[PDB]
């Protein structure tokens, strides 16, 4: 109905709780392997944030996998920064990590992150 | 780090995608039964929104259940309205449903919804 009222903070409060479940390893259902590093997560949050994970977990065979191995060229710190962004809306973008973050966001298909990386790089040229 | 940048719309965009997955029945992992009605959902979203579901799905036996039956006194339309609110931040509160919505939100332990129901009822006294 068009007569709904809306609770402004609801979406951010849901995301905070999903991150608390991730921190406590509650109902995590996939491990993402990035070279020597493993990251536990919820498939639904990954799909909701990434075009690559949306494609992976909607595939009729890959939806059932409990381990996903990323391309060996992917930087684990870049992936960690993006996984934290998925669960918090906050991106720890620094001069020392921006190239790895942008490459990882292009691979994961995270357009808004790629856009802000491109802008920060362009400002330093 | 405290040097993070933040994408304002991220949390609302994640919630929109979680609702799209719910609509398409993608990676839903529980059925909530409310008398004669069944509602498919994601356990993590339910836990993130409700004190009752947070308690249920953190229990070492109930976390593994694929069907949860609610108390027979719970109104299915009231539950449906609250499940839609969990996934959208929008509450379809009407004169004809407010009593059932408030009773259901008290049972589910959804404090902000109970508070707005109490205010709307108090305004009509």
């Amino acid at each position: 109905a068009d007569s709904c009222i809306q609770f402004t903070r609801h979406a951010s409060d849901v995301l905070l709780n999903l991150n608390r479940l991730r921190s406590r390893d509650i109902l995590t259902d996939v491990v993402i392997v990035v070279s020597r590093e493993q990251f536990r997560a919820h498939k639904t949050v990954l799909m909701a944030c990434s075009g690559l994970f949306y494609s992976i977990f909607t595939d009729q065979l890959k939806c059932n996998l409990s381990v996903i191995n990323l391309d060996p060229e992917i930087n684990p710190e870049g992936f960690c920064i993006l996984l934290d962004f998925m669960y918090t809306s906050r991106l720890n973008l620094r001069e020392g990590n921006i190239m790895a973050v942008m490459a990882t966001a292009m691979y994961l298909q995270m357009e808004h992150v790629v856009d802000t990386c491109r802008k920060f790089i362009k400002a330093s040229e | 780090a405290d040097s993070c940048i933040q994408f304002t719309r991220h949390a609302s965009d994640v919630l929109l995608n979680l609702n799209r997955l719910r609509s398409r029945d993608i990676l839903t992992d529980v059925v909530i039964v409310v008398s004669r009605e069944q509602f498919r959902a994601h356990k993590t979203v339910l836990m993130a929104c409700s004190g009752l579901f947070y308690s249920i799905f953190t229990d070492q036996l109930k976390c593994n259940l694929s069907v949860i039956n609610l108390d027979p006194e719970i109104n299915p339309e009231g539950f449906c309205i609250l499940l839609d609110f969990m996934y959208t931040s929008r509450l379809n509160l009407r004169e004809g449903n407010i009593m059932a919505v408030m009773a259901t939100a008290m049972y589910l332990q959804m404090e902000h919804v109970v508070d707005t129901c109490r205010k709307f009822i108090k305004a009509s006294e």
Partner: peptide, 5 residues
């Protein structure tokens, strides 16, 4: 919080 969206 609550608002008219």
């Amino acid at each position: 919080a609550w608002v008219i969206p």
